[PDB]
Every structure is written in structure tokens, then in C-alpha cells.
Design an enzyme around this catalytic site. Structure first.
Site, PDB file in Angstrom:
ATOM      1  N   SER A  22       0.810  -1.204   0.000  1.00  0.00           N
ATOM      2  CA  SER A  22       0.000   0.000   0.000  1.00  0.00           C
ATOM      3  C   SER A  22       0.848   1.261   0.000  1.00  0.00           C
ATOM      4  CB  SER A  22      -0.888   0.072   1.262  1.00  0.00           C
ATOM      5  OG  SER A  22      -1.702  -1.077   1.412  1.00  0.00           O
ATOM      6  N   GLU A  49      -1.635  -1.209  -4.072  1.00  0.00           N
ATOM      7  CA  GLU A  49      -2.797  -0.488  -3.564  1.00  0.00           C
ATOM      8  C   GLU A  49      -2.397   0.957  -3.275  1.00  0.00           C
ATOM      9  OE1 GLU A  49      -4.197  -1.058   0.547  1.00  0.00           O
ATOM     10  OE2 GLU A  49      -6.261  -1.277  -0.299  1.00  0.00           O
ATOM     11  N   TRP A  50      -3.221   1.900  -3.729  1.00  0.00           N
ATOM     12  CA  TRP A  50      -3.063   3.303  -3.327  1.00  0.00           C
ATOM     13  C   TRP A  50      -4.107   3.566  -2.253  1.00  0.00           C
ATOM     14  CZ3 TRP A  50      -4.622   8.068  -6.741  1.00  0.00           C
ATOM     15  CH2 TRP A  50      -4.334   9.237  -6.039  1.00  0.00           C
ATOM     16  N   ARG A  51      -3.642   3.816  -1.033  1.00  0.00           N
ATOM     17  CA  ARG A  51      -4.515   4.171   0.091  1.00  0.00           C
ATOM     18  C   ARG A  51      -4.733   5.684   0.087  1.00  0.00           C
ATOM     19  NH1 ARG A  51      -4.960   1.251   4.800  1.00  0.00           N
ATOM     20  NH2 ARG A  51      -5.908   3.266   5.506  1.00  0.00           N
ATOM     21  N   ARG A  69     -10.072   4.122   2.299  1.00  0.00           N
ATOM     22  CA  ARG A  69     -10.508   3.412   3.495  1.00  0.00           C
ATOM     23  C   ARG A  69     -11.094   4.470   4.433  1.00  0.00           C
ATOM     24  NH1 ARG A  69     -11.708   0.041   2.518  1.00  0.00           N
ATOM     25  NH2 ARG A  69      -9.977  -1.409   2.139  1.00  0.00           N
ATOM     26  N   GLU A 121     -14.000   2.421   9.085  1.00  0.00           N
ATOM     27  CA  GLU A 121     -13.391   1.086   8.844  1.00  0.00           C
ATOM     28  C   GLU A 121     -11.877   1.041   8.994  1.00  0.00           C
ATOM     29  OE1 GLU A 121     -15.159  -1.546   6.071  1.00  0.00           O
ATOM     30  OE2 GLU A 121     -17.122  -0.609   6.331  1.00  0.00           O
ATOM     31  N   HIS A 127     -14.394  -4.198   7.336  1.00  0.00           N
ATOM     32  CA  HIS A 127     -13.345  -4.205   8.342  1.00  0.00           C
ATOM     33  C   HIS A 127     -13.943  -4.004   9.688  1.00  0.00           C
ATOM     34  CE1 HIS A 127     -12.096  -2.722   4.514  1.00  0.00           C
ATOM     35  NE2 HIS A 127     -10.959  -3.355   4.695  1.00  0.00           N
ATOM     36  N   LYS A 179     -13.813  -9.107   0.443  1.00  0.00           N
ATOM     37  CA  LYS A 179     -12.702  -9.006   1.376  1.00  0.00           C
ATOM     38  C   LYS A 179     -13.184  -8.636   2.776  1.00  0.00           C
ATOM     39  CE  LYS A 179      -9.957  -5.365   1.565  1.00  0.00           C
ATOM     40  NZ  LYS A 179      -9.350  -4.490   2.616  1.00  0.00           N
ATOM     41  N   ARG A 221      -2.403 -14.234   7.482  1.00  0.00           N
ATOM     42  CA  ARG A 221      -1.747 -13.540   6.371  1.00  0.00           C
ATOM     43  C   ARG A 221      -0.783 -14.459   5.626  1.00  0.00           C
ATOM     44  NH1 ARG A 221      -2.992  -8.106   6.646  1.00  0.00           N
ATOM     45  NH2 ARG A 221      -3.495  -7.195   8.685  1.00  0.00           N
ATOM     46  N   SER A 245       0.428  -0.919   6.375  1.00  0.00           N
ATOM     47  CA  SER A 245      -0.822  -0.209   6.131  1.00  0.00           C
ATOM     48  C   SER A 245      -1.990  -0.728   6.962  1.00  0.00           C
ATOM     49  CB  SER A 245      -1.153  -0.166   4.645  1.00  0.00           C
ATOM     50  OG  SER A 245      -1.178  -1.483   4.087  1.00  0.00           O
ATOM     51  N   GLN A 283       0.605  -6.757   9.406  1.00  0.00           N
ATOM     52  CA  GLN A 283       1.408  -6.987   8.211  1.00  0.00           C
ATOM     53  C   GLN A 283       2.874  -7.146   8.580  1.00  0.00           C
ATOM     54  OE1 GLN A 283       0.817  -3.626   5.691  1.00  0.00           O
ATOM     55  NE2 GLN A 283      -1.314  -4.089   5.342  1.00  0.00           N
TER      56      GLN A 283
HETATM   57  C1  LIG Z   1      -7.947  -4.369   2.490  1.00  0.00           C
HETATM   58  C2  LIG Z   1      -7.244  -3.564   3.573  1.00  0.00           C
HETATM   59  O1  LIG Z   1      -8.179  -2.835   4.397  1.00  0.00           O
HETATM   60  C3  LIG Z   1      -6.465  -4.632   4.337  1.00  0.00           C
HETATM   61  C4  LIG Z   1      -5.487  -4.033   5.309  1.00  0.00           C
HETATM   62  C5  LIG Z   1      -4.810  -5.153   6.044  1.00  0.00           C
HETATM   63  O2  LIG Z   1      -5.358  -5.649   7.058  1.00  0.00           O
HETATM   64  O3  LIG Z   1      -3.744  -5.647   5.615  1.00  0.00           O
HETATM   65  C6  LIG Z   1      -4.525  -3.109   4.574  1.00  0.00           C
HETATM   66  C7  LIG Z   1      -5.343  -1.999   3.911  1.00  0.00           C
HETATM   67  O4  LIG Z   1      -4.455  -1.092   3.228  1.00  0.00           O
HETATM   68  C8  LIG Z   1      -6.310  -2.585   2.884  1.00  0.00           C
HETATM   69  O5  LIG Z   1      -7.063  -1.569   2.224  1.00  0.00           O
END
Ligand SMILES: *C[C@@]1(O)C[C@@H](C(=O)O)C[C@@H](O)[C@@H]1O
Ligand SMILES: *C[C@@]1(O)C[C@@H](C(=O)O)C[C@@H](O)[C@@H]1O
Lengths: 252, 252
Positions: free
Chosen positions: A21, A46-48, A82, A86, A143, A170, A213, A232, A236
Site C-alpha cells: 500500500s 494499492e493506493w490508500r 478506506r 473502517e 473491516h 474481502k 496472512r 498499512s 502486516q
Molecule cells: C484491504 C485492507 O483494508 C487490508 C489491510 C490489512 O489488514 O492488511 C490493509 C489496507 O491497506 C487494505 O485496504
């Protein structure tokens, strides 16, 4: 399973795809990030855009999109605002969110957009149909940064996303216990066993959830997020370590 | 939690400990294997005595144990005769199995023995008490190469091993589905949540179960088996790849 292909990348088969991201607050920071990120190995960018300070400015957001594409012309590119609701960085009105996503679609610069399911059924469906009319795929998302819903609830939520036209449902949830991590894995496997029409992305956040993950190939998560330098979302790990584990699991 | 320490190795805390299995058919092959294995990195050496052809000779078995100890004088050493009934290479009488394990105990050459729970309560208890009288720990074990019992059944089996005096209860089961892998992880977590008096070793076998060999830190498996060159059971991965994943999970 209806896989999603962007260029020669197939989402929904094989090893889970690695997403990273961009989080820059302005055009220059986005540019510098894109130029750094192209020296890392991953599948989807991904561009946040919720990190972007000048969110109201049509010229600013499109200039930033162009600098991303100048840096990485070919990479699969996912446009994500986002909401703070969320776990994101700011809040905009529903109409501005819809306008923003439609502008990303119209630009031709993005391959995929993220739409949050709980924006509302009718608005989400209309935007999905607009994306599809302009050859853009939809990651539909949800989320919960506080707790983990039941597996039954998560499955019904992902199924609803399919029903609204999501290409890739997702869900990201926060564990409060190790048991909650298993609940998320169970929901993921339920999709694979019973509702395998669309690729799904799932994750349990934070350190407790990190196995979710890594084990996407086993239980049925089609993609996973790694950190180039900064995460992000909580949980992670460094993108090269993520890649190393995914490869070991695939080839075991 | 009553951890098990052999030299400066603590089983039942931190990162799961890596076990590798030496498999040789005769004294010369055992020697050659020991000399190769000392150039690999792992925490505990298991000698799979059921691979040894001259099993009828207690003195031959002891000679082989001595060659292993000549090669690796310090390593934690686990003596394991795996019966064919539980996935091993041959069958011996219960009396000869007990005799062999008691000879291993008396030799001073081994730190731990494996005893199969289903050998029978009275014989297992007597042998555990003998091991403990001579400062040898017991990995008490069970294996189902055909199917995965319920989580309730696996938990009661591990608890019975504790009740018979096991230092480390261990169970290995064969998944028939991805769901069975989750069942094994659930049983593992149940021990951590509710019955955390002894370190337990758990695994779901085969490629489907490999995540169970990697996620021991999060759900509560105290050790995991890797392959130096050849697997000693289905699903083991190369020991260096195992170590890489364990380190990533520990430091995440
Ligand atoms: C999909 C998303 O909300 C998942 C996040 C994560 O839990 O890794 C990272 C976010 O950047 C992403 O949009
Ligand atoms: C404990 C044990 O039966 C576990 C096997 C495994 O599944 O990794 C390997 C055997 O060598 C060992 O005795």
C-alpha cells in the site's frame, strides 16, 4: 471459481497474491513512494488514498494517479479510500466517496477499486455496475477493528458482497483471542468449501492474527498484504518475509 | 506449564523446537547419518530405532546409540521405536519394546524416550516411572495415519498422557480434508487455553496439514519435525525452510 485476471496476474488460484500500500499525503510523497516501491517484489499495488490530504481536489487526486502510473505503468493498481469508520485515516461524505471512486474508474489509470460494503447496498451496487461498464474490477470490503464476528456472520457478509456484484469479497477483523483467529480461518475455509464462486481475501489483524496472512493457500485467501517499509494495517509483516513464507507453503 | 529442559534447551516456551529424525538400517548407516546430521541446524535429535534391522539384539541397538553419541555428544537425544501399528517400519513384542526402552534409559546415552500411549496403561506407567527414576524424560505419543479424531477425543487423549506421567504429550493425525487440519489446530489451542500443564506436540500430517508444523507458536505446539534429506513422516518440510518460517512467526 471466477478468477480475476489483471494483465497476466490471476487472482483466485495458486499462491496468494501480495499487495502493498502507498500511503503518501501529497503528490510528491506518492511519487517518491511509487519510485521506491518499484524496487520491491509484489503482485498488486494499492493506493490508500484516504492518507491523501487534498482529497477534495479533483486535479490533485488525478495528478497523483498519473505520477503513480509514470512510476509503475503496468502493475495491477487498486484504488482504495478506506474510511475512518473502517480503520482509515479520514472521513468524507458518501456522495464524495462515490464521486471519487467514479473518477478513479473514469481515469483509466486503475485496474481495481475498493468499495466498502457498509456504504449501503444501492450505492455500492450502482458503483459496481459503473466499474464493470468501464472494465474495472471491484474488491468489496468490510473491516472490524474492534472484534471478530462469528464465522456465520462473516460468511453471510462475504456472500452478500458476491450478491452485490463484487469480483473479490474481502474482510479484515480484529482478534481479541487466539480463538478468534481460528474463527476467521474457519470462515475462510467455509467459503472455499461451500461458496467458492469468487476469490475472497480474508485476514485476522494484529500479531495474534498473522498466521492468517501466511496461510491463504491452505484455507482460501486469494491475497495478502505486506509492508514495504511501513505497515498499512496492524499485523502486516515485511513483504520479503511474507513472500518467503508463501513460497515455502506453495512448494511444500 | 511445566517446561522440560535438556541442557540449556527449554521445551514449552518461545519458538517451537525443531526435531529431526535419524533413520539408519544398520550400525554403519546410523554412523554415516549421525556424521551428516551434525552439519545441520536443529534443536533435538530423534533416533528412529524402528528403522534398525537388527532390532532383536539389545546390544546392537546400544552400540548404535553409542555411535550417535560419539558423533553428537551434547545434542538432546530422543530414542523412539515407532511401531508399524502407529506408522513405523516394523513390529516387536510389547516386552521387547519395554526392554529396549529400559536399556536406552539405563545406558545414560539418551535424554528422552518416546512411549506410545496405546501400548497399555500399566506398562506405560511403569516405564514412565522407570524413566523418571533415571532422569530421562518421556514424550508420550499417539498416531493415527488414517483419520483425524474429534478435537474432544484428541484433548482427552493428551490429558490421559499427562495423567500417566508424560513430560510431553504428542499426537500426530492424518487429515482427510482441510477441515481436519483446523480440528487439529483447535485441539492444540484447547490444550493451551484449558490444559496447559505440560508442553504438547501436535501435528496434522501430509501436505494438507503442513501449516500445523509451522504455526506451533501461535496455537501451542512445543516442537515440530523437519527433514534433513528425507522426511520421517508425511508432511515434513526441509529443516532450513521450517526454521525460516518459525523465525519469521516468532519475530512478527
Ligand atoms: C484491504 C485492507 O483494508 C487490508 C489491510 C490489512 O489488514 O492488511 C490493509 C489496507 O491497506 C487494505 O485496504
Ligand atoms: C513423533 C513422530 O511420530 C512424529 C512424526 C511426524 O509426523 O513428524 C515423525 C516421527 O519420526 C516421530 O516419531
Amino acid at each position: 471459481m471466477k478468477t480475476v485476471t489483471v494483465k497476466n496476474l490471476i487472482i483466485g488460484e495458486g499462491m496468494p497474491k501480495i499487495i502493498v500500500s502507498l500511503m503518501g499525503r501529497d503528490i510528491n510523497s506518492v511519487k517518491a513512494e511509487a519510485l521506491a516501491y518499484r524496487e520491491a517484489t509484489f503482485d498488486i499495488l494499492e493506493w490508500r488514498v484516504d492518507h491523501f490530504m487534498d482529497i477534495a481536489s479533483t486535479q490533485s487526486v488525478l495528478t497523483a494517479a498519473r505520477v503513480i502510473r509514470d512510476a509503475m505503468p503496468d502493475i495491477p493498481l487498486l484504488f482504495t479510500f478506506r474510511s475512518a469508520k473502517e480503520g482509515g485515516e479520514q472521513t468524507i461524505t458518501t456522495q464524495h466517496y462515490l464521486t471519487l471512486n467514479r473518477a478513479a474508474i473514469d481515469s483509466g489509470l486503475v485496474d481495481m477499486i475498493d468499495l466498502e460494503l457498509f456504504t449501503g447496498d444501492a450505492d455500492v451496487k450502482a458503483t459496481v455496475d459503473y466499474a464493470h461498464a468501464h472494465n474495472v474490477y471491484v474488491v468489496m470490503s468490510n473491516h472490524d477493528f474492534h472484534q471478530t464476528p462469528s464465522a456465520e456472520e462473516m460468511v453471510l457478509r462475504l456472500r452478500k458482497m458476491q450478491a452485490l456484484g463484487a469480483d473479490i469479497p474481502k474482510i479484515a477483523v480484529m482478534p481479541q483471542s487466539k480463538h478468534d483467529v481460528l474463527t476467521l480461518l474457519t470462515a475462510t475455509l467455509e467459503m472455499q468449501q461451500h461458496y467458492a464462486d469468487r476469490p475472497v481475501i480474508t485476514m485476522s489483524m494484529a500479531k495474534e492474527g498473522v498466521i492468517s496472512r501466511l496461510a491463504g493457500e491452505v484455507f482460501g485467501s486469494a491475497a495478502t498484504f505486506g509492508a514495504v517499509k511501513q505497515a498499512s494495517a496492524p499485523g502486516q509483516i515485511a513483504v520479503n518475509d511474507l513472500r518467503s513464507v508463501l513460497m515455502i507453503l506453495h512448494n511444500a
